[PDB]
């Protein structure tokens, strides 16, 4: 039993033609791609793997000229109809045929697989089971998102997308993979994986666990009539003189700092101790409000770690306190 | 060449260097005393030259002195979360030394990419400018208030230890039961069969009786395994 990006069994695979005037359109890439092509005249000649396919960014190329295999990863300038008529980096060189290929890109590596089963059914994909050996591996590592094929122009091909399923592979004696079961294909197959045997005899078998997913979410907190009196402090008709700074104690109420924050009539909403956004979130036991009147220069003067007339003579602010000075 | 390369890129865009298919000796790296920090997590440093690795990645970048501690498994910091993140489990070594010699001329070439990346997956390089993102209501201009453009610049001056530039290179090893592209400088002995011998093939290790096998591997395969997934058959590296 192994878990890997496999083609789900009995899946839908797009079937593009090389007939009547036809084309080879660009298809999205994915965690992996299944490419199976049926041939009588060996028409299919290529692949492309690029993010852009327009020479802006690196684009891997695979092309088979008559007896040579070519791999390049430059920023090629591809034609809008890239077809083969009848900052550069690494390079490599070397229907009766069904040349299946699995092109997967993982962990910065680009892996290719292959098989060449001969077929007599020209209509569609043959029922059967051929495993795919790893043809070549090469460490390209590109943020590949797209995919296009190159056809020899004077042979339909299929495209399927791999998924992260779990499969049970039945290795034979000499090592060929002869059968496999897709553990999530159908409830019968879930049993075969759990039993770890291909034949499942009469009886009832426990396989998996049902679950009900939590649908919504709730966060709660009790409403309270203990609203902060900050508005009363700011809107008091008369404040006392600066020398007699009235100290008002605040407790046992919920404080809407945000409403203060959103209100903009206050000319200066200076804060040192705590960022005003966190004020609503963060909660303390003791809140003290001081009220008094001064000139504009003194509004500057009333700040922590500062020496001045109002700053020192009548109302002093320690460097350390967590608080905000609001003047309008 | 990488360790004593003349220039390394800034941290926000760290170059990734792939090492494979070469014999690598780490005694040379170990022996030099210029290296301020040689901290290794997955593997003890002395044993590096002995072992075989499936893959080696070399990452190079320049950071201030205070940030070197942040380049660690499961470490949280300004540069760690935003710029270069190590998986908690990664098997590798961290190599750091001062850059006041080669840099710190004010030096503004080096950029370290602030708020614009808030949480970052391990081992990706993020170079996107993202003009002014971090947090704001207006967007997509040279705009001011509370946008505060991400790629802020290190200023390196000889005045700047904690603020001195430190070149750091991080080696990540990939370890697996596969053909190890890179191995240490160990000679090969002759093969002995039908006898109880302690053996390591391609750095595989183990003790057993080496016998010729009638079983026929497929060309790509290298290691066989048993029902219990216990290594029973191997393909000799030198002679197939």
């Amino acid at each position: 039993s192994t878990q890997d990006l496999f083609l789900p069994f009995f899946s839908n695979v797009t079937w593009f033609h090389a007939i009547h005037r036809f084309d080879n359109p660009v298809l999205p890439f994915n965690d992996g791609v299944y490419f199976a092509s049926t041939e009588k005249s060996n028409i299919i000649r290529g692949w492309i793997f690029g993010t852009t396919l327009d020479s802006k960014t690196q684009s891997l190329l695979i092309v088979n000229n008559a007896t040579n295999v070519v791999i390049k990863v430059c920023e090629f300038q591809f034609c809008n109809d890239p077809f083969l008529g009848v900052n550069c980096t690494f390079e490599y060189v070397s229907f009766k045929n069904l040349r299946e290929f699995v092109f997967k890109n993982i962990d910065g590596y680009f892996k290719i697989y292959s098989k060449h089963t001969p077929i007599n059914l020209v209509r569609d994909l043959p029922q059967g089971f051929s495993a795919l050996e790893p043809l070549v591996d090469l460490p390209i590592g590109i943020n590949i998102t797209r995919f296009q094929t190159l056809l020899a122009l004077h042979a339909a091909y299929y495209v399927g997308y791999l998924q992260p399923r779990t499969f049970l592979l039945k290795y034979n004696e000499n090592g060929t993979i002869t059968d496999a079961v897709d553990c999530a294909l159908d409830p019968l197959s879930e049993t075969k994986c759990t039993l770890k045997s291909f034949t499942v005899e009469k009886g009832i078998y426990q396989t998996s666990n049902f679950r009900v997913q939590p649908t919504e979410s709730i966060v709660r907190f009790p409403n309270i009539t203990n609203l902060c009196p900050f508005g009363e402090v700011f809107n008091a008709t008369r404040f006392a003189s600066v020398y007699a700074w009235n100290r008002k104690r605040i407790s046992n109420c919920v404080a809407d700092y945000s409403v203060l924050y959103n209100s903009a009539s206050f000319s200066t909403f200076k804060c040192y101790g705590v960022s005003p956004t966190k004020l609503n979130d963060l909660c303390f036991t003791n809140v003290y409000a001081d009220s008094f009147v001064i000139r504009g220069d003194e509004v500057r003067q009333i700040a922590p770690g500062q020496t001045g007339k109002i700053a020192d003579y009548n109302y002093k602010l320690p460097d350390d306190f967590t608080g905000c000075v609001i003047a309008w | 060449e990488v360790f004593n390369a003349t220039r390394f890129a800034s941290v926000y865009a760290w170059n990734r260097k792939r090492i494979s298919n070469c014999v690598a000796d780490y005694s040379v790296l170990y022996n030099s005393a210029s290296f301020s920090t040689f901290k290794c997590y997955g593997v003890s440093p002395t044993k590096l030259n002995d072992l075989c690795f499936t893959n080696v990645y070399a990452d190079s970048f320049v950071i201030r002195g205070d940030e070197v501690r942040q380049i660690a498994p499961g470490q949280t910091g300004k540069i760690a979360d935003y710029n270069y993140k190590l998986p908690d489990d990664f098997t590798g070594c961290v190599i750091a030394w001062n850059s006041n010699n080669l840099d710190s001329k004010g030096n503004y070439n080096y950029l370290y990419r602030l708020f614009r990346k808030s949480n970052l997956k391990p081992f990706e390089r993020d170079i996107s400018t993202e003009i002014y993102q971090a947090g704001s209501t207006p967007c997509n201009g040279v705009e001011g208030f509370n946008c505060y453009f991400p790629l802020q610049s290190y200023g390196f001056q000889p005045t700047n230890v904690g603020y001195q530039p430190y070149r750091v290179v991080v080696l990540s090893f990939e370890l697996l039961h596969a053909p190890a592209t890179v191995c240490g400088p160990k000679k090969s002995t002759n093969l002995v069969k039908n006898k109880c011998v302690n053996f390591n093939f391609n750095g595989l290790t183990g003790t057993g009786v080496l016998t010729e096998s009638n079983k026929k591997f497929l060309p790509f395969q290298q290691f066989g395994r048993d029902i219990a997934d216990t290594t029973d058959a191997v393909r000799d590296p030198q002679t197939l």
Partner: antibody
Amino acid sequence: VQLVESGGGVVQPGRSLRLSCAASGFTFSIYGMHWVRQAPGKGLEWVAVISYDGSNKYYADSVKGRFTISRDNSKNTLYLQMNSLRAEDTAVYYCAKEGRPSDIVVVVAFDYWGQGTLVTVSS
Amino acid sequence: DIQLTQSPSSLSASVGDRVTITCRASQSISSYLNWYQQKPGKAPKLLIYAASSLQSGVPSRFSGSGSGTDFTLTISSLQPEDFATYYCQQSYSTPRTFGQGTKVEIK
């Protein structure tokens, strides 16, 4: 870090001129660039700003339509294309770089200046 | 547009005096002034940014403070080289603007 300005001289009213500011000593392509002008004996007047990539360009009230700012990140050079010049445009023009001194990066600030070049619009 | 008005436009004082220059904004920009020192015939030099942070290389006597709309530039004890024209400058939004300038002369 150096900002070399040029392109000044005498221009008749109504003609055009291109100012240049060559950047060195820092990574130019990542910073906004500003033009600031100072009329003779007068105060500073912000002129135009361009984003790092040149996609965003804003101009002051007095120069909308007439002034065009441009950028060459390959040569690390800043340009200011001034058109339909008039008597009031006579000023010593500075190129300037965004900059931010420490971690209060939420300040996005103003910094090192070029030497400034004199432009005289006169017949 | 955000308008920044400096007051006084000029003032005379002697070396060692404590000076105060105020810049008031038409709207709250809440931390986004920048204070520069300009000498005649040369480009300005940045002094205080975010209205309260001292820029490297500028003497510690220079100080700025305030947020919102009321801001102050202060030099604790004047020296002969500090007699100059000082401009406030907002960065809250575009277009960026300057104050009209404050000239400090010798008494």
